[PDB]
Design a protein around this nucleic acid. Structure first.
Ligand code: ZN
Ligand code: ZN
Ligand code: ZN
Ligand code: ZN
Length: 1188
RNA sequence: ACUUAAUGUCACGGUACCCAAUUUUCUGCCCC
RNA sequence: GGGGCAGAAAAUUGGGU
């Protein structure tokens, strides 16, 4: 009586090379994969997959013994004995397992039990010749066939419990159950006595080859070549540095649709640029990169958009990188015991962006681009493997039990501990989310503690899934009683009203990746002892648990005896305190720029730097929510606290964090342990209260010599908005384990307190004043153990030529301080704060002595004057959220320029390779901008910082805090503006008229009241000059007070005094901000309101001295009288304000032009005036020019 | 046949896990 | 008599089990 039996795997099963019983001993995989499916080749490719008949027989007899245990060793009223499992040749496989037994004449080969003949105890065939078997299990063949088509190699793992690191790993060949998941075989049964029991066992076999199963009776060559063409074309442009970034852009293009390249939506470049985008408008093969990508897309339509973009990015990455003992255990259950099997169906919603790691492609081949890829199956949809889910359940049960074991491999004895007993009764299925969308890329860097900049070779990208995917959850427990320890884990994982889910599933848990909120839980159970008849009929609802989750099988009454969350002893005692949540919102009153630069090149808008935004999946509405959520990354959130504790405790700056037990290694984990604190993303919850959530802020580095924009230094950032009147709320959180002593909890409380004080700004451009934290409010749900724990300068400058004129002076002069530059090779590290050095904050007022011009260049039509005069770049004053502000880059720019001039630093921003030979070829070699810290750093470069060394002085965005707001012109278009003159580029050829003239110094602008000429001649300037050359903008009035902070850290005793002197050089001396400096606009006076010092302790005026006084002493060796030093007397003459009488200051005109005798081509003629122009345009800060 | 051996397959018997701040520097500025 | 730059230099994987 032949029986045709067909397999059907409902989750990825595993297979191994068949080898042989003699040859299995040689290879570890074959012995490990004895119970898996088998693979034999038909070269080493295109084999055939099968599962051995012996394995199916072992599963069947295990089902038989289980069923007979259910029915006291008697199925269908036919009694069966206890069987035999002892041998005096041994079988090819030894049971090494506890055997289910029962209470139950002798058995011979005449009237053997159905169990006996199912085992084939007394058949003609023993240990192979012909089909003499009473029951025969033939090989089950799957029903060409390359292995990579059926299976993909996967590296599994064994994670330690006391630590969090892996202890060992092994590979696997999880097959494709979707397509190649059906195996057909023959079972021949000579004796009809055990046919019913055999069929019942077939229907009772639940899983084989590591997968739930049912038993029922009866291209690249062309794309890589074109990527090589693109790389060679970039070589022709010498732009090979951005082919690495271009690969990332192509990889992220898979997130966007085909329209981003078909109907070009990539940034098109500036309108007047004439070069287009710096990356997309690159001629490859003489053809633009956007058009080249479009041609490639229409030439590779067959493979699909996501595949094409992935392969193109991977290929660009490759070409860039290519060039860069024997015991029997009879277990008899007590008579009358009731055994059941519970089903735990539900959805594993991801409360955090998850990550399930997988080995890199070309290494996962059984038989690419991102550093860490996420695990997906063949259809590119996210997968939660049962092995990763079961491994987390084992850890969580061990936590719930409180006493488990480190699971041992190869043990001849089943582990008798609490957790291992229940893992054998627990079976749980593999799950894939029905969401076939590309995983988001989340980059990561490591900051160098010494320099507070990135570490060399420490940038990597991680494929992470969206937050909110709902994966199906199936958990079957077959036992006599449902354990309260497993119910606790189900309740621990369940997302209650305040539990919010605690299923830490997958990897990267320290950065809050993979905290799943298990939900939609329904409990179903089978009365397996007395309601087994239709458990075989329905196959235990195997493979159709989605129907159970949606909704009525017979014999599957719901389990209503499932305890609540606050009713289980192992939950509240062991699982509830396992991780303690600390939720808090960070209030930042400054623009926030997390600098998602890769996404900037792809999204429309054409911004050099944009803000990082997440991609949150919505379960209710399906798909991804159209509006992405802006957030400070959890890794950025994690690393800021890690840096915070390192500087407070001195753990940062260590030579190497080996197997270390310091405070930071203990709290945040290291090579040989796991972090006991894990952080989540800092989502912006204050996003809907902003009229324009992001803000376009333009920046440019001003040349020290010419006082104008550099050759290539103009860059625009696109951070979030935010101001003191309207800050950003960032409701992040972190989880605290139950192992922190009082010292460590207080050590983190201080770290968060330092965040509140503003020591660690969020995102990039912290020194510019981005991401400055204005305060932290702790959530109520935070445990009480944590929440409860939380100047006038009297210097006066004389002045020489202006007082004795009641003369026309040149609008700018040069500070020739010489080439003597002192470099601090002993760089001050941003590591643990030094006791002898000083840190704190400076509160400074900012009074405008002349009208101020800080344009909000986010709009070229802020005053709405482009319609009347096309091409007229009308500007509005800089403002965030509607209130006027001065960006800290503007404040840092003049102070650094003043500090560099005061301390005789180098020309940090200088236009080299500019013909006048080049400008850089005549600036000596000590005033040149500083390279890496090997050659030392200038006092300005040691304080404000340079490349690969963060500056120790942070300038904030100046608020306003009352004052006379606007200057009223009474005749301008908005009645609160001023049309400026033709602001032309600085001309170094005037200051360097010949090769004999080596170089003038830093260009500084006088403090004249020449803006009144512009104010008075408003009618004569809007008509005699073309609108596209002039600029109009609203200007501040006289005596406008601002307020900005200077978060200075790790400054020497004299460095702080130097900057205070740099901030407030004294009476009659001020600074210059914004446009109109040649026109007398923007003369600002800085007054230090209060200096605070932490080691929070305000220093008095008596202590303000001896900072400036020895800062004066430092200048000597390179009340104080600053005019004694020759280069500070010249410096303060330029910054001298001669109206605190009314000197006349203007540029000469070209010949008899529209004058107001002091004309170019006469004053610039060698015959009329010798080449002493530099002798009076430089090194003489107030030389008269009209009488000369 | 490729491929099982049979009175004994806890491999669902093992989380690809751990360490890392997309940041550092830059006045939206200006005359032959 | 004339608009000029509108990003540049870097790091874009290194260690464990
Ligand atoms: Zn028997
Ligand atoms: Zn154990
Ligand atoms: Zn350490
Ligand atoms: Zn320098």
């Amino acid at each position: 009586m032949n029986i045709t039996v067909e397999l059907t795997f409902f989750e990825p099963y595993r297979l191994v090379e068949w080898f042989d019983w003699d040859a299995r001993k040689k290879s570890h995989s074959a012995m490990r994969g004895q119970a898996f499916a088998q693979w034999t080749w038909k070269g080493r490719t295109a084999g055939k997959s099968f599962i051995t008949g012996t394995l199916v027989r072992s599963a069947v007899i295990k089902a038989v013994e289980e069923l007979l245990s259910l029915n006291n060793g008697k199925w269908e009223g036919v009694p069966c004995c206890n069987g035999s499992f002892q041998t005096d040749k041994k079988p090819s496989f030894l049971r090494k397992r506890h055997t289910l037994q029962w209470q139950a004449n002798i058995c011979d080969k005449e009237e053997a039990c159905p169990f006996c003949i199912l085992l084939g105890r007394f058949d003609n065939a023993g240990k192979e010749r012909n089909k003499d078997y009473d029951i025969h299990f033939s090989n089950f063949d799957l029903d060409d066939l390359r292995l990579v088509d059926i299976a993909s190699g996967r590296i599994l793992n064994r994670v330690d419990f006391d630590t969090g690191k892996a202890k060992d790993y092994f590979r696997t060949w999880e097959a494709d159950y979707e397509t190649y998941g059906t195996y057909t075989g023959r079972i021949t049964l000579r004796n009809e006595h055990a046919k019913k029991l055999l069929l019942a066992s077939l229907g009772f076999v639940d899983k084989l080859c590591g997968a739930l199963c049912r038993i029922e009776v009866i291209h690249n060559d062309e794309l890589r070549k074109q990527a090589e063409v693109i790389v060679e074309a970039f070589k022709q442009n010498d732009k090979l540095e951005k082919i690495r970034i271009l690969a990332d852009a192509i990889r992220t293009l898979r997130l966007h649709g085909e329209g981003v390249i078909e109907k070009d939506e990539l940034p098109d470049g500036k309108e007047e640029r004439d070069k287009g985008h710096h990356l997309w408008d690159i001629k490859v093969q003489g053809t633009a990169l956007r058009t080249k990508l479009k041609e490639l897309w229409q030439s590779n339509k067959d493979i699909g958009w996501r595949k094409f973009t992935e392969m193109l990015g991977s290929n660009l990455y490759l070409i860039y990188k290519k060039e860069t003992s024997d015991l029997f255990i009879p277990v008899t259950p007590p008579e009358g015991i009731e055994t059941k099997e519970w089903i735990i169906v539900g959805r594993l919603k991801a409360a955090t962006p998850f990550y399930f790691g997988v080995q890199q492609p070309s290494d996962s081949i059984p038989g690419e681009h991102a550093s860490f890829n996420i695990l997906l199956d063949k259809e590119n949809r996210y997968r939660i493997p049962r092995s990763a889910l079961r491994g987390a359940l084992r850890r969580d049960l061990r936590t719930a039990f409180g006493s488990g074991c480190n699971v041992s491999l190869g043990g001849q004895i089943l582990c008798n501990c609490k957790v291992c007993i229940e893992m054998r009764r627990i079976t749980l299925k593999d799950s894939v989310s029905d969401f076939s969308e590309p995983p988001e890329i989340r980059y990561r860097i490591a900051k160098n503690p010494g320099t507070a900049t990135v570490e060399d070779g420490s940038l990597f990208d991680i494929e992470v899934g969206p937050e909110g995917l709902t994966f199906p959850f199936v958990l079957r427990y077959r036992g006599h009683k449902f354990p309260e320890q497993l119910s606790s884990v189900i309740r621990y994982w369940e997302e209650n009203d305040g539990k919010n889910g605690m299923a830490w599933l997958g990897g990267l848990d320290s950065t809050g990746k993979g905290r799943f909120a298990l939900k939609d839980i329904k409990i179903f159970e089978w009365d397996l002892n007395q309601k087994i008849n239709e458990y075989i009929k329905e196959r235990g609802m195997r493979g159709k648990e989605k129907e159970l989750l949606e909704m009525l099988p017979d014999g599957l009454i719901p389990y209503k005896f499932f305890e609540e969350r606050e009713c289980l002893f192992p939950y509240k005692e062991n699982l509830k305190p396992q991780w303690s949540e600390v939720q808090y919102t960070i209030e930042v009153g400054s623009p926030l720029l997390t600098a998602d630069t890769i996404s900037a090149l792809t999204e429309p808008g054409n911004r050099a730097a944009i803000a990082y935004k997440k991609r949150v999946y919505n379960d209710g509405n399906n798909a991804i929510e159209p509006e992405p959520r802006f957030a400070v990354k959890s890794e950025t959130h994690r690393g800021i606290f890690r840096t915070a504790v390192g500087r407070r405790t001195g753990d940062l700056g260590k030579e190497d964090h080996e197997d270390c037990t310091c405070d930071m290694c203990i709290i945040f984990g290291n090579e040989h342990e796991s972090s006991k604190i894990r952080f989540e993303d800092l989502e912006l919850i204050n996003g809907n209260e902003f009229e324009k959530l992001e803000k376009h802020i333009d920046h440019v580095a001003i040349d020290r010599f010419t006082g104008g924009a550099l050759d290539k230094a103009k860059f625009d950032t696109y951070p979030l908005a935010g101001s003191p009147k309207k800050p950003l709320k960032l409701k992040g959180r972190f989880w605290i384990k139950k192992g922190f002593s009082g010292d460590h909890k207080l050590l983190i409380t201080t770290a968060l307190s330092d965040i509140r004080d503003g020591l660690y700004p969020l995102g990039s451009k912290g020194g510019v004043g981005y991401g400055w934290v204005a305060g932290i409010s702790i959530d109520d749900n935070v445990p009480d153990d944590f929440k409860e724990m939380i100047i006038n300068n009297d210097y006066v400058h004389p002045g020489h030529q202006s007082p004795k004129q009641d003369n026309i002076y040149y609008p700018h002069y040069f500070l020739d301080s010489g080439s003597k530059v002192y470099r601090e090779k002993d760089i001050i590290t941003h590591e643990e704060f030094t006791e002898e050095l000083l840190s704190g904050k400076i509160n400074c007022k900012l009074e405008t002595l002349t009208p101020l011009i800080i344009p909000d260049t986010s709009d070229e039509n802020g005053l709405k004057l482009q319609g009347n005069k096309p091409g007229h770049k009308n500007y509005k004053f800089f403002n965030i959220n509607g209130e006027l502000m001065i960006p800290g880059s503007e404040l840092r720019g003049m102070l650094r320029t003043h500090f560099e001039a005061l301390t005789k630093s180098c020309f940090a921003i200088f236009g080299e390779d500019s013909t006048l030979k080049t400008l850089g070829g005549k600036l000596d070699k000590a005033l040149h901008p500083c390279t890496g810290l090997s050659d030392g750093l200038c006092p300005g470069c040691h304080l404000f910082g340079t490349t690969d060394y963060k500056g120790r002085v942070k300038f904030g965005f100046a608020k306003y805090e009352n004052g006379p707001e606007w200057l009223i012109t009474r005749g301008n278009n908005p009645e609160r503006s001023l049309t400026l003159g033709v602001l032309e580029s600085p001309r170094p050829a005037f200051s360097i008229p010949d090769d004999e003239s080596e170089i003038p110094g830093r260009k500084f602008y006088l403090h004249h009241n020449g803006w009144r000429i512009i104010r008075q001649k408003q009618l004569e300037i809007r008509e005699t000059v073309q609108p596209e050359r002039n600029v109009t903008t609203e200007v501040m009035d006289k005596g406008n007070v601002f307020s900005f902070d200077v978060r200075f850290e790790n400054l020497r005793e004299w460095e702080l005094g130097l900057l205070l002197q740099s901030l407030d050089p004294g009476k009659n001396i001020a600074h210059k901000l914004g446009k109109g400096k040649p026109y007398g606009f923007g003369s600002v006076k800085i007054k230090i309101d209060s200096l605070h010092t932490f080691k929070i302790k305000r220093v008095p005026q008596s202590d303000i001295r001896e900072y400036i006084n020895k800062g004066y002493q430092k200048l000597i060796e390179w009340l104080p009288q600053w005019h004694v030093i020759p280069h500070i007397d010249k410096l303060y003459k330029l910054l001298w304000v001669p109206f605190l009488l009314e000197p006349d200051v203007r540029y000469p005109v070209l010949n008899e032009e529209s004058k107001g005798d002091y004309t170019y081509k006469k004053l610039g003629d060698k015959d009329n005036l010798p080449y002493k122009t530099r002798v009076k345009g430089l090194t003489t800060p107030w030389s008269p020019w009209n009488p000369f």
